[PDB]
Amino acid sequence: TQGLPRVIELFEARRPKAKAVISEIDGVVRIEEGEDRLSVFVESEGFSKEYKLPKDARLLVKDGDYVEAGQPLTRGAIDPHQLLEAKGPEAVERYLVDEIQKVYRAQGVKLHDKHIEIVVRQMLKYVEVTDPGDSRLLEGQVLEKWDVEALNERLIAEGKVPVAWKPLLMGVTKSALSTKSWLSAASFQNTTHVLTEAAIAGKKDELIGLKENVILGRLIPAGTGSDFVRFTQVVDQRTLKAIEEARKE
């Protein structure tokens, strides 16, 4: 597939048509049989993992070749969820960006990677718990807010459980969906679920993002509405010394 459909496929972390098999394990390649049935083995010392192909499939490892942890066997597109678990979160990030660009580039478009990066990182915002310290053992949690517990219960109040987690490739939509602040969350496909829930828990916003404050009619937390700049006062020569002569009174 090409064009915009690809860019969505990508930005949405979507397990495509012609997943074109990757080897789960390292090892040595062995193509076997033609026309009748086509299968490929990547068997190292110990394990012998077998990858049955369509037969029509245009595989791109010839017999004998040595192979890599998550290396493509077959051609086609690659599942970004299969890549996550086989070969980590960075390798994922690096696939997404470089593939998304593979199209804008291929066409005519020139844009900087950082944009795509900024977005891609958000696809990696959350992680699911395995064996917790405080909360229930299954919940999805923001990568940072788990460090708010991991490197918290292993320093000052050290002990209990560091909270083990798993890397969690969220598609662009899904990730947008699971977004802390209820105000923002409300604007998506089912506003009731949000509010119902957020009402039960004394949930609070804090209104960090923008989608939030525009909803309220508040002054956007960016540009001139950035905490880092909007408090800036300007005092004016004679105003300053005259303001100084009523301070020691």
């Binding site: 509010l195 009402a199 309220l216 009619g217």
Partner: protein
């Protein structure tokens, strides 16, 4: 009157939503950094 314009007290949008929420039960407390309440209404 040749004045600068704004200092908009509170986005009406805000008031509206809060009240449009009350109407459906749900308290919707608005709170400053000291975490106590504000009353975006005075009336």
């Amino acid at each position: 009157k040749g004045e600068d314009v704004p200092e908009p007290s509170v986005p009406e949008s805000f008031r509206v939503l809060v009240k449009e929420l009350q109407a459906l039960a749900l308290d919707v407390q608005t709170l400053d950094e000291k975490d106590n309440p504000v009353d975006i209404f005075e009336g």
